[PDB]
Design a protein around this ligand. Structure first.
Ligand SMILES: Nc1ncnc2c1ncn2[C@@H]1O[C@H](COP(=O)(O)OP(=O)(O)OP(=O)(O)O)[C@@H](O)[C@H]1O
Ligand SMILES: Nc1ncnc2c1ncn2[C@@H]1O[C@H](COP(=O)(O)OP(=O)(O)O)[C@@H](O)[C@H]1O
Lengths: 40, 512, 479, 51, 367, 141, 141, 180
């Protein structure tokens, strides 16, 4: 029950925030081109 | 298996007909030494609890009288004692000075000062282990003790003659609670010439290190608090008997205030190091142990210590001796031996937690487990009028707490409880070494319970409170003086209060 | 010199009989007629001119009636600048195979602590270059520090990083004490200090050596040594440090590895010394035997000793008597966790168990205090949703709670950083993160000016520039 | 609507099973507590009588 | 230290004890020569329950009483003494010379204070027990004996055994635990001359009913009386929990098979009302059938009927005392469960001691 | 045969053996009989008492190791004598109180390893109303 | 080196030291070696037995306090020597049986605290199909 | 007790387990001396399964493929895997229920209960208090039955059709008779 809950929680959070990080990596360079090395 | 009388230096006399037993009942010879214990042959006539003195200036207490030897515990290190060293009585049971010469002074468990400021005047020297007061000399608690913490003064009140345990985990704010309780009494002792409305303080430390005892003394010298308190220090370098005796020395120092018509509050810091020391002394005197190796005289020990905390009647003088013992629980389990013995001995409980110390709730008081067997009898009516409400409101909040993470879907009559509970929880928060008065507490809790904080952002309540305090202390000292004099919140003062609150809210702007 | 005769032998305990002039307790006796040097320390007096003593070395080869010589003083260790660069035993003998100690002085390892009248000093701030440490548990310059943890969490690694980031820059001296740790670890520490100039050994044509420089002293009571040695080696190193404190007025550093072994090596002999056992199996004389040490470990008006003790915590149980009694003796505390080290978050510091006497608004400003407390509040809020997430899921959480979880995870991953001494595990280079940089980055993350960034950026990084660079890189490989 | 009704029923059954498990674990906890106490006390007594 | 009554000098006929309390005499009937547990601290009306039991047993049964404080707080003892002197349980009238005149009272007191060593807290229950055996044997009375806590007796026994060097048992308790508890509790019984009832307060350490102290006490307890602040917060006094309470005398042989039926009916009703409350907490009280609302009404009505005033609380409240016999209580519960008095209002039942007074209060509240 | 709580511990330890000796007369004289020891846990508690007061070394739940022998000495006498020993008999209905229905304890298992059956009784069934509250899945013979 | 159960306690107590003595020849003579102590808990059992029959007083779990100095002596003989002492080596691979996976005990804790790694083995993984059933999370080096 | 060059002793020892504690020192020591093991359980006896053998605490040294064949070895290991996978779901089944589970897990639970009930046998000496006659069962029959139950050639049958039946012909006849 303990390792069960912990590992389920960790996997769910990992998947969710993996998706969110993918989306943010998609939409970063547009809204923050000052970091984009394309213009440097 | 041989007795000290059977060694082959004494039997060379007994066989030789030597009858030089004229060695008095005062003098004895050391027979064995170890771990802070000595064992003598002779002194047939020494009392239990009596002081004895060695060749090299040191002293000790005789505890385990036996048929063939005497067991002594040493107030120092065993490098001085050896090989039949002479031990002589003193005749006096262990005692300590008492008087106003201790106010503002730090002392060990025998009155010997360690401030480096000079000796201690003492017209009176009192014993350390005494009988506690009876039933008839005592009185019923009808007077409060503390201001400085809204949560305590409202929901876990402490009276004069009460025994309110401060139990919690390491690094929660226990020493901070104690030092705030000490610091608050400055305004009340400086605003009075009579020594019957004041409250003196005694701080016994057990198991503490000097590099924090000194910080406590520094903080009190910063705030001029030592003029009405005194410290008794039995640190880790100080031997087990001194750690064992310091609480009784403090009770002896407080009995002077109790019997003489005054009021004192005594603060035993780390009683568990007292019990520890007693165990360490019983397992070295080879006494029979119990569970967790503690002897059977631990309940009796703490009982002797705490049953002196009292409220005497008007025929004895009307004095008092409140008690705030402190206990560290190593897991939150208050089912252990020493916790169960102390909650069984004490008149209440203040339970601090660690999950709340990091949520910003400081003091981290869990008011579900914190109780006070005295109750509103130790409260002015001005505080009753608000605490009787706040207790119910916070109980409802505790009944509907888990719904805070699902409040988006719930309904009113259940979101209002969450809002009021959050507002009160953020109002009871307080700053280290910044205690308030009871009038200010009543004003602020009226602002809280009467719904003047529901529509606010909670993060702003600390501002609200601060500004309101400054405002009222600038503007309505008449209101504060009336509440402090009458000890009641009448309808006229309530109208004045609502007026001042509305004026403040109009003058100021908050987020939500 | 007196003379005595061994009467019986039981393990590390030796009962001795003298005809006259018994020695006081704690005095040192030398066994005569043995292969190597064998020292005994008196612990008790039993009567009939009999004493009981604890051996520093093994009793194998001892005989009843063998002769013993009292020295008239306890175990005296040599002291000075001649112990520097050199390794020493509990009895002062060197075990570095470089010659004898040409010290002009010796101190008894048994001394009395400085009294209450000898006060401490101001709470000086210590900069380690570690983020979670410098932020949430600032280390004091003149006070005791604790690294509590079980097995496999990075205690001696953290100590090595602290040594690299503090001792080399320190102008005062430093002492290391290995109390029942591994010998491979001792060899590694000695080699790394010889490498990095903390020790400067120079061999000479005439077969001698020269330890000039070498602002460090080492003491070892390692596993192979018996109890009595594991017990007294801490006193030995503490006397070596008290020398530099009291006389030379220097500022000193004092690292100790597995102080728990001290207590263990008490409990290994107490029942042989005739004491009744206390609770779970330690001895009765735990708190006093520990306090006589700790009270000698303190700042005074002549010098200062900043100490750093690693505390083994068996079975991750902090309710054990040794840690329970040791928490009260420390100015700063730092608790390492396995649930955190399993996530690869190194250093694996628990910021909800780490504390410090220094973390107050008057010492560190409110910009630091409020930042630390906001971080701790965020992490406790994240901890108070673990069960809701494990049962229901992230679908149930509001966007406030999702923001909280995101920020808390980013802080968790961000407090990690790579050390210079962990190259041989990770391969990555080491970082030194100053405290204003840490506070700036934490304030930014809590304020919300980095929510657009991903989470794998805040890993093994020492600042925000590297985070933005890693996010740029991950977006490039994303397209 | 059927989904939500079944969800409420499942929450009821889960809370009931949790109460049962809490009862059982409380019994086991008290048993192990007494066992620990007895074991430690017998250890102490045998170490006190083995001198 | 007196030998217990023999096998020949013992009454084989068990009999109830007419207290004067409704919930007690209905759902947890006491016995003569019995031993009744009392699980409850402060904030529940325990001292007032004690004084009412004393006063009613002295008025009706003509018997005296004894109170033993086994390691009690001293201020608590002072409070109890002054409460007795206020409520009239004790009559301490001054005399001219300066002595006192302890005229007609209803309770002796024996106190072993916390500051006293172990051995007193262990021989105090025996002191009070001999004081009660005097009244039982010679005077021939049915007396009471209240015990402030029975766990401190065991604490003191364990301490004394540790001092004397006896090897402790499972959880540190002495090896003479059941033997000493039997030496105590076998003197509290009925004989051919009189009787001694006893009301022992019990403390379950760590909620462990398997600890040997309560496990040995429950074997001797013939009843149980739980208190709760969750019924005192409703203003109900006495705050006796009618469900948690039990008794060995409720069986349909000592009380006839109408007392048993009424008691089981009331317990069924209160369990149903508890479940209905747990439901109404969620679904609201609009989704209830008429029979469910009838059950709720009858349950609240009987829960407020069982409350009553006290002769001793008169001085604190002014409202006088009401003695209620058991047949009267049985008839009232029968009618309330039959549904006859469902036309009455709610607050007529509260703080009332019989249907006569309830109907009179309703007649007067109609105005 | 009465050995009550006030009676000494040796007398509680005895009374079962005295009853079994009283029944051995019927067993050896061809009669038939039945003994009902209404509490054996108290006999075991008294034996533990006597041992701890005799300084003997405790064991599991502080009970010594001679408890199995103590109970089996007594219960192995209940027997059906044969054709040449008269033909008598002596049953035995020993009684045991548990704590929260725990039968994985030491004394219940010690006696279950001695007996030829089991009649179990429940507080659930006894509070519901089923009386005699004799369970039937746990009771065996 | 077989010190079996019929073999006396002192032989069981001496066998691992005898193995280390046989391995120090390799360690010192420029050669390499590996030594596998199998059932290293029986050594501690034998030490407990010896000290209890020699009337020495016990510690916790009835063991003495010298168990740390029983295992430290033994495991500190494993070593990698320098190029001046030959260049030999003595690797060590002790073995421990836990009960119910309890590694919070005394002997497992000591040996984990005095080793340069861990290789945990589980029955859940042994029966799920993973053989060898090595848990690579807890296992370290 | 050991086989030698002169003769052989087969041995069958019954080992008590006090307070149902298998961590006691006596059984702990005894475990090291055995060539084959069979641990009976009360949790499994309370279900009416007899013999109440726990096949996970039970073990042996003669199970390797070099002693028993590879089909025997693989069947045994697959059964152990199945029963462990069913053990791992006990908590979530107790709290939430089987409905939360996926379909693979439900199939696992079904086959695990079926093979539990199939690993029960009425003995001959139990006829006096069970009534039903005894069932000797050969090894290839046991192996075929386990193979089929693992494959899925008996999922159509009920769960109480495996109780005290020996082979599978009895199970199928009992399922037929229970269909009525
Ligand atoms: N109201 C408060 N406001 C701000 N900080 C607080 C407050 N209360 C406590 N703290 C912090 O809690 C820490 C410990 O305080 P304190 O020593 O009083 O607790 P303790 O549990 O008695 O500690 P210990 O167990 O070491 O004796 C301190 O670092 C203090 O700064
Ligand atoms: N930053 C880190 N980088 C790589 N490995 C680390 C790091 N921190 C800890 N480790 C772990 O620290 C462990 C070393 O622990 P050590 O301090 O030597 O003994 P102890 O377990 O007593 O603390 C290594 O096994 C290693 O897995």
């Amino acid at each position: 029950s303990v390792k069960f809950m912990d590992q389920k929680r960790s996997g769910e959070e990992t998947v969710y925030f993996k998706k969110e990080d993918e989306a943010l990596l998609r939409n970063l360079l547009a809204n923050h081109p000052e970091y984009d090395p394309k213009y440097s | 298996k041989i007795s000290p009388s059977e060694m082959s230096r004494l039997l060379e006399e007994r066989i030789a007909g030597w009858k030089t037993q004229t060695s008095t009942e005062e003098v004895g010879r050391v027979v064995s030494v170890g771990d802070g214990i000595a064992r003598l042959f002779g002194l047939e006539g020494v009392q239990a609890g009596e002081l004895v003195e060695f060749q090299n200036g040191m002293t000790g207490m005789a505890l385990n009288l036996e048929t063939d030897n005497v067991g002594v515990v040493i107030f120092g290190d065993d490098r001085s004692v050896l090989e039949g060293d002479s031990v002589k009585r003193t005749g006096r049971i262990v005692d300590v000075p008492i008087g106003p010469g201790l106010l503002g002074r730090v002392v060990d468990a025998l009155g010997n000062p360690i401030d480096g400021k000079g000796p201690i005047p003492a017209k009176e020297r009192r014993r350390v282990e005494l009988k506690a007061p009876g039933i008839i000399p005592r009185k019923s608690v009808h007077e409060p003790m503390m201001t400085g913490l809204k949560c305590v003064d409202a929901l876990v009140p402490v009276g004069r003659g009460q025994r309110e345990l401060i139990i919690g985990d390491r690094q929660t704010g226990k020493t901070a609670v104690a030092v705030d309780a000490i610091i608050n009494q400055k305004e009340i002792n400086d605003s009075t010439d009579d020594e019957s409305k004041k409250l003196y303080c005694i701080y016994v430390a057990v198991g503490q290190k000097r590099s924090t005892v000194a910080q406590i003394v520094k903080a009190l010298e910063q705030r001029d608090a030592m003029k009405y308190t005194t410290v008794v220090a039995a640190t880790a370098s100080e031997a087990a008997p001194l750690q064992f005796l310091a609480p009784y020395s403090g009770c002896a120092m407080g009995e002077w205030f109790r019997d003489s018509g005054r009021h004192c509050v005594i603060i035993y810091d780390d009683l568990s190091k007292q019990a520890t020391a007693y165990r360490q002394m019983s397992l070295l005197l080879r006494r029979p142990p119990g569970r967790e190796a503690y002897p059977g005289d631990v309940f009796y020990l703490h009982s002797r210590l705490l049953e002196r905390a009292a409220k005497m009647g008007d025929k004895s003088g009307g004095g008092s001796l409140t008690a705030l013992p402190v206990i560290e629980t190593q897991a939150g389990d208050v089912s252990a031996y020493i916790p169960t013995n102390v909650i069984s001995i004490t008149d209440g409980q203040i339970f601090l937690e660690t999950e709340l110390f990091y949520k910003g709730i400081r003091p981290a008081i869990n008011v579900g487990l914190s109780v006070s067997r005295v109750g509103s009898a130790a409260q002015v009516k001005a505080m009753k009028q608000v605490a009787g409400t706040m207790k119910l409101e916070l109980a409802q909040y505790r009944e509907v707490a888990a719904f805070a993470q699902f409040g988006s879907d719930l309904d009113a009559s259940t979101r209002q409880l969450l809002t009021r509970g959050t507002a009160l929880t953020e109002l009871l928060k307080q700053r280290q070494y910044s205690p308030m008065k009871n009038s200010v507490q009543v004003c602020v809790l009226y602002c809280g319970v009467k719904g003047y904080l529901d529509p606010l952002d909670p993060k702003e309540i600390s501002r609200f409170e601060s500004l309101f305090i400054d405002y009222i202390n600038a503007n309505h000292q008449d209101i504060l003086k009336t509440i402090e004099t009458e000890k009641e919140l009448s309808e006229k003062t309530e109208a004045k209060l609502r007026a001042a609150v509305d004026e403040f809210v109009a003058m100021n702007e908050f987020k939500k | 010199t007196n003379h005595g005769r061994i009467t019986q032998v039981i393990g590390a305990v030796v009962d001795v009989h003298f005809d006259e002039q018994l020695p006081p307790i704690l005095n040192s006796l030398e066994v005569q007629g043995h292969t190597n040097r064998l020292v005994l320390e008196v612990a008790q007096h039993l009567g009939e001119n009999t004493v009981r003593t604890i051996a520093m070395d093994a009793t194998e080869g001892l005989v009843r009636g063998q002769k013993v010589v009292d020295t008239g003083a306890p175990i005296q260790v040599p002291v000075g600048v001649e112990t520097l660069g050199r390794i020493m035993n509990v009895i002062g003998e060197p075990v570095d195979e470089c010659g004898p100690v040409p010290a002009k002085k010796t101190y008894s390892i048994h001394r009395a602590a400085p009294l209450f009248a000898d006060q401490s000093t101001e709470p000086g701030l210590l900069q380690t270059g570690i983020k979670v440490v410098d932020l949430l548990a600032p280390y004091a310059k003149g006070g005791k520090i604790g690294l509590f943890g079980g097995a496999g969490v990075g205690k001696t690694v953290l100590i090595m990083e602290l040594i690299n980031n503090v001792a080399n820059k320190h102008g005062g001296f430093s002492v290391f004490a290995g109390v029942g740790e591994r010998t491979r670890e001792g060899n590694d520490l000695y080699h790394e200090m010889m490498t990095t100039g903390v020790i400067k050994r120079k061999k000479l044509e005439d077969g001698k050596f020269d330890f000039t420089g070498s602002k460090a002293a080492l003491v070892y009571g390692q596993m192979n040594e018996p109890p009595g040695a594991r017990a007294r080696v801490a006193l030995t190193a503490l006397s070596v440090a008290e020398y530099f404190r009291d006389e030379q007025g220097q500022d000193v550093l004092l690292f100790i590895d597995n102080i728990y072994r001290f207590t263990q090596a008490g409990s290994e002999v107490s029942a042989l010394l005739g004491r009744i056992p206390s609770a779970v199996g330690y001895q009765p004389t735990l708190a006093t035997d520990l306090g006589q040490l700790q009270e000698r470990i303190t700042t005074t008006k002549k010098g200062s000793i900043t100490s750093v003790q690693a505390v083994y915590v068996p079975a991750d149980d902090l309710t054990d008597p040794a840690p329970a009694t040791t928490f009260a003796h420390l100015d700063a505390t730092t608790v390492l966790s396995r649930q955190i080290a399993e996530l690869g978050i190194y250093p694996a510091v628990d910021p909800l168990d780490s504390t410090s006497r220094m973390l107050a608004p008057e010492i560190v400003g409110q910009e630091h205090y409020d930042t630390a407390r906001a971080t701790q509040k965020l992490l406790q809020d994240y901890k108070s949703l673990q069960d809701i997430i494990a049962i229901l899921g992230m679908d149930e959480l509001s966007e406030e709670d999702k923001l909280v979880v995101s920020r808390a995870r980013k802080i968790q991953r961000f407090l990690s950083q790579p050390f210079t001494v962990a190259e041989v595990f990770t391969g990555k280079p080491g970082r030194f993160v100053e405290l204003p940089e840490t506070i700036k980055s934490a304030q930014t993350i809590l304020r919300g000016e980095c929510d657009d960034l991903p989470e794998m950026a805040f890993y093994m990084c020492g600042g925000l520039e590297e985070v933005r660079s890693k996010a740029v890189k991950m977006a490039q490989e994303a397209a | 609507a059927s989904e939500q009704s079944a969800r409420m029923s499942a929450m009821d059954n889960a809370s009931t099973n949790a109460g049962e498990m809490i009862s059982s674990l409380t019994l086991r906890y008290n048993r192990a507590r007494q066992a620990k106490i007895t074991t430690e006390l017998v250890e102490i007594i045998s170490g006190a009588n083995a001198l």
